[PDB]
């Protein structure tokens, strides 16, 4: 019946600040060690700074110290962390978690606890729904959609509403130079269904309230 | 500053078997602030082992670590398929932490080459003055290959983006999609657009290729 919230995810420009929360129920946090982790897209995870709740006392990552300030609300069982002077550097998502022991002559404490993790992105873009292109199509054939020039992240995308779900493969997003995102989503199927089955991907980007279904249609040279 | 290292990068072993990973601290560090987690996609790390040798509470039992010092190892006597993941060792000094780098444990099965399919840019994008073609390779292992482009024989660089799924639930391969970006000018002024792909289940690269304006 532990659980750490966090609040909702962030877009921010360079250099502006970013404050996330992290909310504890169930448990106090004067008993609790909180930490902040970041991971960045694709990579590893990286310790920034936290709480330790026993000692009332804060602790940074020297690599951060400059710019980032945690908070401890004893009142509200409430963790902040600020982290200013932004770049996409920063860009991750950002995890609470209970990271520190208790060493006492008894054993070694520890929780295990972590939030849901909170995703900020640093970046000039603005946000802007996809288009979505269609990537059209022996015995198996691939089709697919392309939903090129999104921001911010996420986009979801489902075949048939949701009836097609073998042989797809949703890619991870890139992020291009212009600083927006593009995806694309494929399937393999049977190449006698291309003239009988329809094909449509249903593409979702809720930062921009778009929704699109895209029918995609073979080629054929005859 | 502790700095700590992981080994391997990638590990690659089947169900059943036994996997061991490696950390090394760049100085001797309290056993009492070594510890092991587990990452999957999209979720928040997890405690395996805390005290260098603790199993944390609802840990199965093949989770085990030992060492002190330097050097420590996270085992797991006999991988399930939920184990397949990124694990992390941890330390500290201070309540000041730092993560080593990780350790991919995938999935090894059968070697399998990609099947390659290309998708020319379509007519409604070109509307809009840009071009993308896509390369797919699709449902291979193990997770490295090699694509290039060639536009009337021309080697391109540094005008695509790769992406690369996870491997899959059920029959443990990954896919991979490569795009290459254009203008609408240049797509128009030039006639072969060529995807080779390399890998190691292939016995030469395989190429996929269309004349552009070809049905």
């Known amino acids: 019946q532990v659980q750490l919230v966090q609040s909702g995810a962030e877009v921010k420009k360079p250099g502006a600040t970013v404050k996330v929360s992290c909310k504890i129920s169930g448990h106090t946090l004067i008993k609790l060690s909180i930490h902040w982790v970041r991971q960045a897209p694709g990579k590893g995870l990286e310790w920034m700074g936290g709480?330790?709740?026993?000692?009332?006392?804060?602790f940074y990552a020297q690599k951060f110290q400059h710019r980032l300030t945690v908070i401890a609300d004893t009142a509200t069982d409430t963790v902040y962390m600020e982290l200013g002077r932004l770049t996409s550097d920063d860009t991750a998502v950002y995890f609470c978690?209970?990271?520190?022991?208790?060493?006492?002559?008894?054993?070694?404490?520890?929780?295990?606890?972590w939030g849901q993790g909170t995703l900020v992105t640093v970046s000039s873009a603005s946000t802007k729904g996809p288009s979505v292109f269609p990537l059209a199509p022996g015995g198996t054939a691939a089709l697919g959609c392309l939903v090129k020039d999104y921001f911010p992240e996420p986009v979801t995308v489902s075949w048939n509403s949701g009836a097609l779900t073998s042989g797809v493969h949703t890619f991870p997003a890139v992020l291009q130079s212009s600083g927006l995102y593009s995806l694309s989503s494929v399937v393999t199927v049977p190449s006698s269904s291309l003239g009988t089955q329809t094909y449509i991907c249903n593409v979702n980007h809720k930062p921009s309230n778009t929704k699109v279904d895209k029918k995609v249609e073979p080629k054929s040279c005859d | 500053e502790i700095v700590l290292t992981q080994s391997p990068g990638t590990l690659s072993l089947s169900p059943g078997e036994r996997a061991t990973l490696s950390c090394r601290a760049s100085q001797i560090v309290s056993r009492n602030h070594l510890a092991w987690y587990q990452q999957k996609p999209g979720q928040a790390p997890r405690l395996l082992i805390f005290?260098?040798?603790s199993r944390a509470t609802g840990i199965p039992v093949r989770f085990s670590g030992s060492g002190s010092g330097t050097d420590f190892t996270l085992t797991i006597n006999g991988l399930a398929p939920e184990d397949f993941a990124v694990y992390y060792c941890?330390?500290?000094?201070?309540?000041?932490?730092?993560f080593g780098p990780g350790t991919k444990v995938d999935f090894k099965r059968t070697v399998a080459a990609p099947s390659v399919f290309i998708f020319p840019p379509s007519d409604e994008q070109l509307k809009s003055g840009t071009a993308s073609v896509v390369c797919l390779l699709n449902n291979f292992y193990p997770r490295e290959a090699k694509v290039q482009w060639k536009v009337d024989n021309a080697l391109q660089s540094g005008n695509s983006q790769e992406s690369v799924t996870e491997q899959d639930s059920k029959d443990s391969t990954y896919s991979l999609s490569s795009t290459l970006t254009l203008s609408k000018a240049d797509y128009e002024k030039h006639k072969v657009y060529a995807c080779e792909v390399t890998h190691q289940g292939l016995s030469s690269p395989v190429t996929k290729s269309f004349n552009r304006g070809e049905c």
């Open positions: 005290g260098a040798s």
């Open positions: 978690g209970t990271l520190g022991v208790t060493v006492t002559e008894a054993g070694l404490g520890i929780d295990d606890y």
């Open positions: 941890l330390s500290s000094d201070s309540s000041i932490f730092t």
């Open positions: 709480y330790e709740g026993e000692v009332d006392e804060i």
